[PDB]
Structure formats: structure tokens, C-alpha cells
Symmetry: C5
Subunit: 103 residues, 5 copies
């Protein structure tokens, strides 16, 4: 299995690593129909989303998707610094695939 987020990210096309090194500036969560998602922004001006579960997600990703949103909420509330985000760049906002945090 991959040993670092970069290793993991390099396994998928249409992805790139954003080296955030910062806490989340804003957290947005929606339970509106067809828009059950989370959006986060940073002081850098970058915006990212955890996508609404859909056709392109495999079954195994369902729990992971819910975990990622849990992670973003607690990271926001605790002001925990995010190191890097591996994101798909074929979506707007860019779509979160993986996250890493360094202490």
C-alpha cells in the first residue's frame, strides 16, 4: 500500500497535491437534496469539496466519504493544521481524495 499521501495521490490521474500547511478558514455543510456535501476554504483563496456520493464512487468509498467529512469538521473546530490535500482537479471545486496532517 502507499506509504505517503504523495505516493497515494500519484496513483490516480486528474489529481494534484495542494500543500496547505494551514488550518481551515471556513467550513460549510449542506443537507439539501442532491447537495449533501461539505465545502472548505483557506486563507490562500482555495476552495475544496467532499463530493456528493454518486455514480463514480464505489461502495467501499461510502463510509470513507462520511469519515472525510467528520475529519474536516473536527479539524476545523480544533483549528488543526492541515499539511496536504490530494485532490481531483476535474471537478469544481477541486474534490478531496486524501488528507494529511503533520504535528
Amino acid at each position: 500500500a502507499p506509504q505517503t499521501i504523495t505516493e497515494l495521490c500519484s496513483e490516480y490521474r486528474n489529481t494534484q497535491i495542494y500543500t496547505i500547511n494551514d488550518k481551515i478558514l471556513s467550513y460549510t455543510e449542506s443537507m439539501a437534496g442532491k447537495r449533501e456535501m461539505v465545502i472548505i476554504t483557506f486563507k490562500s483563496g482555495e476552495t475544496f469539496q467532499v463530493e456528493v456520493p454518486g455514480s463514480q464512487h464505489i461502495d467501499s468509498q461510502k463510509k470513507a466519504i462520511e469519515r472525510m467529512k467528520d475529519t474536516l469538521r473536527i479539524t476545523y473546530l480544533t483549528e488543526t493544521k492541515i499539511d496536504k490535500l490530494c485532490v481531483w482537479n476535474n471537478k469544481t471545486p477541486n474534490s478531496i481524495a486524501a488528507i494529511s496532517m503533520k504535528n
Copy 2:
């Protein structure tokens, strides 16, 4: 996908943005039958609810409804400031569709 809560809110009928910019004043949670819900209030005098799951909700919203309630509880307990709320105004109290929080 929407980039902000304002963009997200604009996609729906009967919704509107309430700029809160304040922490929750009161949190109420009910496990009484047909009233399995959460009610939040602000010192401005505005009251909002996360609705009891009903037939208007689609399947993808079920986990989202539970998430929103989780978020309100931790937001209240931590005295975290809420920036905006996108709410359905055809319900009383106004029904929460989405929330945004900024540091």
C-alpha cells in the same frame, strides 16, 4: 458544484440566507415520537430547526440530517460562531438546509 453556501442556497426554491455571525444561544434536542429533532436559538431572536425526517426527504438526505444535528450539538458545546444558515422558509421554525462557519 456550488463554491459557497450562498451559491448552494440559490439553487433551491423557498430558501434564504440568514447571516448569523454569532454562537448558538440555546440548543434543544428531542427524542419524543414524531418530534425527533433539534432546535437552536440565537440572541437575535431567530429560531431554526433540523426537521424530523419526512417523506419530503430523499434517501441521500438521511445521513445528512443526522450529520447536521451532530454539527449543531458540537457547535453549541464549543460555543463556535455560525456565519450563515441557508434555510427553507416554508417551514416554522425555519428549516436548516446548510451552515457555514468561519474562524
Copy 3:
């Protein structure tokens, strides 16, 4: 939909409001068969429970019962002050229907 704990409590047959205005003194949790419940007490001596799921409960209450127990634990662990509790008074300990907290 109800806008306060008193309003939802008043919808009921055999309930009453308890003004607590205090943090929880003790928290008890059981995973023993047929006694899967939570019991909390206050310095006043008053004792309450979140009942074991049973035939008197409608299906939509199942998830809410688990949420209420989650709330009581984090409320206890954070020493958060409870405002009021709506309880069904035909059970001992008095059975929690709803909880409210303000700060």
C-alpha cells in the same frame, strides 16, 4: 413544529418539565442485556434515564434514543450546564423526552 422544550413537552400525556440549571453529577452506562440504558443524577438528588428501546417506542425514535445517550455523555464529560429536561413521569427513573441547554 415546536419551538421550545416546553412546547414539545406540552404535547404530552404524562410529562413534566424539570428546571435543572446545573451540570450532571454522575453518569451511568449499562450494556447489560435488557438494561441497555443510561442513568444520570444531579446534586439535587434527581435521577433520570434514557429508557431501553422498547415496544412503546415508534421506529423513528430508535436513532433519537442513541443520539440522546450520546448527548448525555459528552454533556457530562464537558461539564456542560443543562437548562431543562422534559420527562415522561410514569417511569422511574423519570424518562428523558427532551433536553435543552443555554449559555
Copy 4:
């Protein structure tokens, strides 16, 4: 229903109350097959477990088992003082049936 952990514990066979009055010394969690459990210890030299789910458990206990493990973890991480433990003494280490915390 029972008013206290001691009253609840007495409703069962092969159980007894351990007065701990102390925070958890160590926490051990396993996801190894057939050993999916939690083990805790105290400065007193006592060791306890939340058993691996099995035939001895009834359906209503499944979520309760998961809840107890959640409680032990958060109790350990917050250095929360445990009052009493109701344990089954026909298992080694003794098996947790209920827990109480007082502040």
C-alpha cells in the same frame, strides 16, 4: 428501571461491583480477528475487558457494546475518573457490564 449501577448490577448473576474511583491507567484496542475488543487497567493492578461480540449477546446489546468501547476510549483520553464498574466475574479478565462516573 434501576436507579443506580449497584441496583442494576444486582439484577444479574455472576456480577459484582468494583469501586474504582480512579482514571484509566491504560487502554488497549484490538481489531485482530476473533479478538475485536478493548482492555483497560488501573493503578490498582486490575484489568477489565469489553468482550468480543458473541453468542452470549442478544441483539439489543450490539450497539451497547460499541457504545461502551466508545465510552472507555473517550474516558481514557480525557482522564475522566471512573466511579464504579459492574463486571461479570465468570470471564477473565472480568467483563464490563456497566460503568459509572462521578464529578
Copy 5:
């Protein structure tokens, strides 16, 4: 049932104990398809993973795998020191079977 992580670790093949006595240096979480996992690192330079659920896991481990990931996130966020890890050494990075922490 085993009384310590050492006793537990010894019941499986291809495992070994890693004495850590340190907080997690980095935490990585992925929701990418086929890579739904968590990777943790320590200042020692060691790297461990919670494997993607697969054919090597039995039913009972599914909830345990998700719990382990929950434990790693909260342990990382709280800078809690990890005492030891029981890992399967037939995977790269070494795969977490159990974890222990002492206060």
C-alpha cells in the same frame, strides 16, 4: 481473553510489537477508491497503516477496522502518546492489529 497487547500479539502469525512511546507525527486519511485507508508516521521514521477492508478480514473486523481509524484520528488530534502497536509484518507499511496507550 488476553490481558495485554503483548499476550494478544503473540496469538497471531506474522506479527510483532513495536514499542512507540510517542505521539503520532503525521496522520493521512484517504477516501480514494481501493485506497480507503489511514497511514500514520512517527519521528522515529516508522510508518504504519490500517488496511483497506479486504478478503483477509472477517465480518467481525469491519466495525473494528473503522473504530481503529477513529482511534488514530482522535489520538493524533489530541497528541496522545501511543505506547505500543501490534502489527502484521507481512504488509507494507506494517499493518495495525492492536494499539495500546498508557497515562
